């Protein structure tokens, strides 16, 4: 990755430089210099001595300050300093006031702005993930939770006595669709995060599952098995009208949207072993799009439509892999066991998924260039179905 210097911020209620460093490394785009190896610890743009950094192959340095305010809040400021072609030039800088609970958010804001200034890619460090935890609690063992993308600041959205599956975020980040077995069978519901209001979407006979909101906010795709097998359906969210997208006796599920809100990728057993297909929601037959491997399933298409990640079987093993949608090129990304249910960061730089790490008590992160892999912090249960929020 791109070498970069991230210096401890001048003060401590939280280690802001540590957060920036972790964020930049998580993206796979950067290789922040290990803290022990730093040549100096400048607290301001003026204290930067650019030669010590260029000597290490580093052409950008992040410095910052954290100052406490009389009202009990904190000022967090950062400055991005060029240590390459224009040594000492401030490329980017910002300063803001936050109370203690938002110090992590302050760090992620610095990460986002530094990231974007250097890569030209919008940052996703202030985003969230939704997931389901099966705890050992007896009365309500299933919880739909939300946390920051790195596992911090987790909160409970819904608790249930019965299994929950496959949460999906609305594009404005304000709602979560999910599958619940609370009534004694499957139902698809949409829950408004702010007030806890639950809208009933579908509870047809047999299975109701695998929801996905269109990027434009107008439609919800999902699968129903009422006809005798899983088929894809789309609901117009304004009216509640439902249209059948696929028909026939194969199983078609796990829909994910293309950026145009008109096409879906999805998994079908039409060819035998699961493969990924594309279909226009308005008409026409599905087209198979995965030809490499022996099995490919549970796709997520990137927000720019350039590629998709999915669970792919190659050389006998299943891992998270990425398929370029223009070239057809495929790259295996993860190396862990029992890799499943991948979900892309809204900038396409990172994938969150589930594996055997910690016997399923943790979620995993892998950068989409395959350069960096990490476990999220452990939860107090079995964690499944991660869903990466849109930009917030």
């Amino acid at each position: 990755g791109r070498p970069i210097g991230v210096v401890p911020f001048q003060w401590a209620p939280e280690d802001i430089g540590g957060i920036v460093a972790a964020d930049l490394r998580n993206s796979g785009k950067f290789n922040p210099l290990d803290r022990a190896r730093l040549p100096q610890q400048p607290g301001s743009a003026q204290e930067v001595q650019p030669a010590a950094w260029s000597a290490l192959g580093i052409d950008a340095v992040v410095v910052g300050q954290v100052t406490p305010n009389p009202d009990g809040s904190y000022n967090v400021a950062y400055q991005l300093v060029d240590t390459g072609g224009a040594p000492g030039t401030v490329l980017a800088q910002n300063s803001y006031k936050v109370n203690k609970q938002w110090l992590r958010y302050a760090g992620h804001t610095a990460s986002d702005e530094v990231f974007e200034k250097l890569t030209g890619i919008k940052g996703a460090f202030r985003t969230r993930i939704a997931y389901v935890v099966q705890t050992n609690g007896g009365q309500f063992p299933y919880e739909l939770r939300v946390s920051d993308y790195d596992g911090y600041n987790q909160f409970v959205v819904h608790r249930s006595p019965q299994p929950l599956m496959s949460p999906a975020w609305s594009p404005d980040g304000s709602k979560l669709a999910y599958v619940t077995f609370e009534s004694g069978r499957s139902a698809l519901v949409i829950q408004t995060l702010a007030n806890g209001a639950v809208r009933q979407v579908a509870s047809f006979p047999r299975h109701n599952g695998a929801p996905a909101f269109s990027p434009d906010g107008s439609k919800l795709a999902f699968a129903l098995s009422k006809t005798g097998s899983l088929n894809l359906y789309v609901m117009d969210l304004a009216s509640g009208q439902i249209r059948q997208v696929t028909d026939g006796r194969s199983n078609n599920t796990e829909p994910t949207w293309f950026p145009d809100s008109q096409n879906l990728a999805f998994t079908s057993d039409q060819a035998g072993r699961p493969q990924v297909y594309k279909v226009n929601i308005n008409g026409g037959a599905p087209q198979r799009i995965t030809w490499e491997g022996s099995q490919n399933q549970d796709a997520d298409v990137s927000s720019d439509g350039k590629f998709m990640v999915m669970v792919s079987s190659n050389g006998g093993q299943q891992h998270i892999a990425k398929q370029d949608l223009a070239t057809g090129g495929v790259q295996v990304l993860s190396s862990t066991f029992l890799d499943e249910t991948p979900s892309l960061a809204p900038n396409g730089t990172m994938v969150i998924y589930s594996s055997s790490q910690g016997m399923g008590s943790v979620l995993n992160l892998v950068s989409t260039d395959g350069r960096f892999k990490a476990r999220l912090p452990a939860t107090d249960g079995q964690v499944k179905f991660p869903a990466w929020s849109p930009y917030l």
Binding site: P163, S166, H207, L230, N251, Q297, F385
Partner: peptide
Amino acid sequence: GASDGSGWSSENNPW
């Protein structure tokens, strides 16, 4: 218990 009955998807007996 809870399953989509596909025999293969992420919602096939996940729990």
